[PDB]
Design a protein around this ligand. Structure first.
Ligand SMILES: Cc1cc(C)c(S(=O)(=O)Nc2ccc3c(c2)nc(CCCCCCCN)n3Cc2ccccc2)c(C)c1
Length: 278
């Protein structure tokens, strides 16, 4: 609010507006989702890949009842896929919110439709993880999604869990104690990345991204004088670069698992380049 130009203030306001309209932070409208039921070299890697998703799951009913699901151990069989349909439904729900976020923003609406599609295919996973970070509780290792909770299982210990790049990302980013405004500028910087596959208006997207980055740098300078926030802008940009690498690693996991055991919803297939033809 302090020290920004009028264009920078309008930019933050437009992003905060889009975030408010399209982020169901209580997950009140996530419903009707599936739940876990009550050569060989490709299989060996798929087994390791699925370790990237292993969480337990709690559901608190409006009546006060609690269901809890603890996932199995890997015993060399199909039981390792039990959480995939639920995870697909959750990600699909998040992805719809992300697509709505982008479409409310003026700078995005003004790009040609092909570049909108390419930008969303490139960034949807990243914006999803940024939104999930805001409901991550780093004290209990839990993503608190309203009536749903997804909890990390104690291995090993805390430091042995933070070796997994996705978890180190979530814990390190939560430690920065970002404002809502800083999360939503992070989303814009990731969304308007000019080097995503298939982008045509590289120069326009690059100039938009740079403007979002300058606004973030200035927001931090004007509102965060404390020695703990020295280099905060550069810390955030380093997190964004690391998030891009996690996106490539986790996208290849999805594709290997999909090859052995189909689970991607139609929206996930569209976002991740699955044509529907073998
Ligand atoms: C295989 C696959 C790949 C991709 C690319 C997708 S996805 O982007 O479409 N979606 C998606 C959505 C949320 C995700 C996610 C993927 N990975 C994680 C990290 C899981 C936590 C570490 C476990 C620890 C064990 N060592 N989270 C966070 C999370 C937040 C809330 C609830 C649960 C998990 C999918 C579906 C599968």
């Amino acid at each position: 609010v302090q020290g920004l130009t009028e264009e920078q203030r309008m930019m933050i306001r437009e992003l905060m507006d889009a975030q408010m309209k399209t982020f169901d932070t209580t997950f009140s409208h996530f419903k009707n989702f599936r739940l876990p039921g009550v050569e060989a070299a490709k299989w060996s890697q798929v087994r390791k890949d699925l370790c990237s998703l292993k969480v337990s799951l709690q559901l608190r009913g409006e009546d006060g009842s609690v269901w809890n699901y603890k996932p199995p151990a890997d015993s060399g069989g199909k039981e390792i896929f039990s959480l995939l349909p639920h995870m697909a439904d959750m990600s699909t729900y998040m992805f719809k919110g992300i697509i709505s976020f982008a479409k409310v923003i003026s700078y995005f609406r003004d790009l040609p439709i092909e570049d909108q599609i390419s930008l969303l295919k490139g960034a949807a996973f990243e914006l999803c993880q940024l939104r999930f970070n805001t409901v991550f509780n780093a004290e209990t290792g839990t993503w608190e999604c309203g009536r749903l909770s997804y909890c990390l299982e104690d291995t090993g210990g805390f430091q042995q869990l933070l070796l997994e790049p996705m978890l180190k990302f979530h814990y390190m980013l939560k430690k920065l104690q970002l404002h809502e405004e800083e999360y939503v500028l992070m989303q814009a910087i990731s969304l308007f990345s000019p080097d995503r596959p298939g982008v045509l208006q590289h120069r326009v997207v690059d100039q938009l991204q740079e403007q979002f980055a300058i606004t973030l740098k200035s927001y931090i300078e004007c509102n965060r004088p404390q020695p703990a926030h020295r280099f905060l802008f550069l810390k955030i940009m380093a997190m964004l670069t690391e998030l891009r690498s996690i996106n490539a690693q986790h996208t290849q996991r999805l594709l290997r698992i999909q090859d052995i055991h189909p689970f991607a919803t139609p929206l996930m297939q569209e976002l991740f380049g699955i044509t529907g033809s073998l």
